[PDB]
Structure 1
């Protein structure tokens, strides 16, 4: 499902400030990463990235195409293509704690300025 900025913001509220990344920055990051589409599936080539957060089967989730994956998040990648974001967020938090924000390549180029546009005033 293609969610809106505010729907995403409310859903991921519990991630605001973690590892120093704000909700405005995340709103910006996820739009450029998946267009806020919870069913987004993108080939990176050799690897595949899934859902809102575009979590890769290379190291983070286990897919059918790559079963021998490290599966650091301990979850099937199919659980990352639905509208229940709790498990997606738990995995993103592991990536942030281990690798950091640089996993999300859109951060530096698209979310280093003009962050106020990403605010959701709908509480």
Structure 2
């Protein structure tokens, strides 16, 4: 399920300012992390990343590839492949508390300057 820029802007409302990250920063980051696809999957032979935020099964959620994951977000990773971002966002907030925005490498490289392109508001 591929979202669009101003759709994502609307659905990430609850992240506004949390951890000091603006909505433009999040719209920019998720564009460059998953292409706005809530069903994106990127997988090695040692880890899998899931959904709009590309949350990994090494420490954040558990799945079949790593049943022994620390599962810090306490949730099955496949809950990050549906169209309800509510539980995705709760897990994102936990990632922010523990390791900060730089879990998402796209943020520093591509989404910390020129945020005009990512606004869907006055």
- TM-score, length of structure 1 as denominator length: 0.96
Kindly indicate whether residue 100 of structure 2 is the aligned counterpart of residue 100 of structure 1.
yes
Between the aligned partners of 1:32 and 1:7, the Cα distance in structure 2 is 16
Structure 1 equivalent of residue 12 of structure 2:
12
Structure 1 equivalent of residue 90 of structure 2:
90
Structure 2 equivalent of residue 43 of structure 1:
43
Alignment gaps of 5+ in structure 1: none
The number of aligned residues is 122
Q: CA RMSD in A?
A: 1.2
Which structure has more helix as a fraction of its residues? 2
Structure 1 equivalent of residue 61 of structure 2:
61
Between the aligned partners of 1:4 and 1:13, the Cα distance in structure 2 is 15
Secondary structure of 2:49's counterpart equals: strand
Deviation, structure 1 residue 121: 3.0
Between the aligned partners of 2:12 and 2:45, the Cα distance in structure 1 is 28
Between the aligned partners of 1:56 and 1:81, the Cα distance in structure 2 is 12
Kindly indicate whether residue 44 of structure 2 is the aligned counterpart of residue 81 of structure 1.
no
Between the aligned partners of 1:50 and 1:91, the Cα distance in structure 2 is 12
- TM-score, length of structure 2 as denominator length: 0.96
Between the aligned partners of 1:71 and 1:105, the Cα distance in structure 2 is 21
Between the aligned partners of 2:3 and 2:38, the Cα distance in structure 1 is 8
Structure 2 equivalent of residue 27 of structure 1:
27
Structure 1 equivalent of residue 114 of structure 2:
114
Secondary structure of 1:69's counterpart equals: coil
